[PDB]
Amino acid sequence: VKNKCVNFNFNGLTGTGVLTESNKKFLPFQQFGRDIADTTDAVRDPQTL
Amino acid sequence: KNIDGYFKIYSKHTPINLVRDLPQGFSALEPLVDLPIGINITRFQTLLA
């Protein structure tokens, strides 16, 4: 579910946020993105890439 | 590279026109594959056709 306040855990990361589609293109190896403060801001969805 | 019980491989396929020596430049090395081998490796040899 996207664009909605949901408590989520991807691969057990945990946290609360708003899931939105991202135009940024991860490199194939990467799974987790992070912000300047080393806080998780972007993730790669486990079930569907 | 072998780290934390894992054996990782990197790659790059940059095209160059200077045959003499190593080109000034910057190619990053992405992690191609990861595999959990984990050996206390001490020696090294290459195989030439």
Swiss-Prot record, chain B:
Domain of life according to the entry: Viruses
Listed result of changing residue 21 to G: In strain: Beta/B.1.351
Effect the entry attributes to changing residue 16 to V: In strain: Omicron/BA.2.75
Glycosylated residues, chain numbering: 40
Impact after mutating residue 19 to G: In strain: Omicron/BA.2, Omicron/BA.2.12.1, Omicron/BA.2.75, Omicron/BA.4, Omicron/BA.5, Omicron/BQ.1.1
Subunit structure: Binds to host ACE2. RBD also interacts with the N-linked glycan on 'Asn-90' of ACE2. Cleavage of S generates a polybasic C-terminal sequence on S1 that binds to host Neuropilin-1 (NRP1) and Neuropilin-2 (NRP2) receptors. Interacts with host integrin alpha-5/beta-1 (ITGA5:ITGB1) and with ACE2 in complex with integrin alpha-5/beta-1 (ITGA5:ITGB1). May interact via cytoplasmic c-terminus with M protein. May interact (via N-terminus) with host bilirubin and biliverdin, thereby preventing antibody binding to the SARS-CoV-2 spike NTD via an allosteric mechanism.
Cited function: Attaches the virion to the cell membrane by interacting with host receptor, initiating the infection. The major receptor is host ACE2. When S2/S2' has been cleaved, binding to the receptor triggers direct fusion at the cell membrane. When S2/S2' has not been cleaved, binding to the receptor results in internalization of the virus by endocytosis using host TFRC and GRM2 and leading to fusion of the virion membrane with the host endosomal membrane. Alternatively, may use NRP1/NRP2 and integrin as entry receptors.
The protein's name in its UniProt record: Spike protein S1
Species in which this protein is naturally found: Severe acute respiratory syndrome coronavirus 2
